[PDB]
Amino acid sequence: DRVAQLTIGNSTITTQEAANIIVGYGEWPSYCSDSDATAVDKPTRPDVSVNRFYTLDTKLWEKSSKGWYWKFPDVLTETGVFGQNAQFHYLYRSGFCIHVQCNASKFHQGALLVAVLPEYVIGTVAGGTGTEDSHPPYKQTQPGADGFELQHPYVLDAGIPISQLTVCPHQWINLRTNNCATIIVPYINALPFDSALNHCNFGLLVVPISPLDYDQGATPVIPITITLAPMCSEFAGLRQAV
Amino acid sequence: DRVAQLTIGNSTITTQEAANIIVGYGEWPSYCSDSDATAVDKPTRPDVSVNRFYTLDTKLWEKSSKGWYWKFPDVLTETGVFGQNAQFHYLYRSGFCIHVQCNASKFHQGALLVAVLPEYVIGTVAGGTGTEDSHPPYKQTQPGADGFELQHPYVLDAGIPISQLTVCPHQWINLRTNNCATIIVPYINALPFDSALNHCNFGLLVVPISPLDYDQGATPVIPITITLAPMCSEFAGLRQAV
């Protein structure tokens, strides 16, 4: 009976689940009172048009799915008015409300680990047995709004153990218990502003740790819907031409 | 020594000339507290980004120039962020600060009548002597930011005498006396909102009533620079796709 409305776009969702909302590193997104000049040409802080409810195309969870990831702000970099601001500016800074939701029956099974990893650098294979230095293409490093599937979830496609991914801001989605997860991410960088199109401040991982299962006859694919809203987006730069 | 700055764009100009600023029909541009629903999706009132100093390409005044006209909001309809708002919205409403300026020596001569005529309907020739019903093309009715030159200034290209154009909000530019003119135009319509791309609320006329003259050796063309800034622009509509 609860419909959460923010903007021009409206979303129906139950809140706040099993463990409430996870605020990453105990820190809400904030504007930039501090940095850096201060110049008159200083940040352009839009609201609430740009900072609205963006819902990506749904992903289909399967018995054999290895997991997916998205890069920020690369996901929205070509999406709507946020996409417009990110492209035709020089400096960028923002926080995010990330919301991941499943729709499944009480007869389905499985557990997703949803986590946020700052500076998520991808490493691909150098040959199954060998040392060939190839670096991932744009389709893999900056996979856009469509995201990308993990090749080796155990090492998070970066030689780093997923068993310890819970050191990052995270929330579990156990179909048995909850169908949704919300994570709040502040701007995290060694600089106050950076390039939106050349630097991805963090990655969003959604990995099945307990595989999807069901008896035959039930819907064989479970939808994972992702809604995300930028929170204290700030655009310096000025003019640009694609 | 005075530089008027409003926005992202800055303009150097002396103010306020011979007769001060002409406020059309004694009425400043206003927002829309009244009309019409009121709906929640109601107007989007941008500031000050969209409502900035737009300076069109300069026109060259000649001994033989008959005069020019521009249509509003057709002029800015493809110009910058205002152009963007006007195209991808359904309803539009705005006022304008129109500023026309000449650069000439104390050895040049001439007088421009700068006036604003609401609902400026163009009529072309039906044959020099005859009755053929042809209607002006888009290039003439909605000439864009580049404006259009009058064919028959005496009848304002509409069978209407220019000798009486001073019934409209107007200001004289007499090179002898002044080099600039400023006119303030409120939104004038039989409706509170309308189409920006299909309806031109008013026209801007600049006509030499006393022809440009000079002795040979002086610069033979006098520049007419036009700077205009929307004032209480209001955009209802919502979504659109070109």
Side-chain angles (χ1 to χ4, degrees), chain A residues 8-9 41 52 84 238-239, chain B residues 8-9 41 52 84 238-239:
Chain A
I8 243 180
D41 188 30
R52 52 165 285 188
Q84 282 287 302
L238 190 48
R239 351 253 163 208
Chain B
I8 243 180
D41 188 30
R52 52 165 285 188
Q84 282 287 302
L238 190 48
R239 351 253 163 208

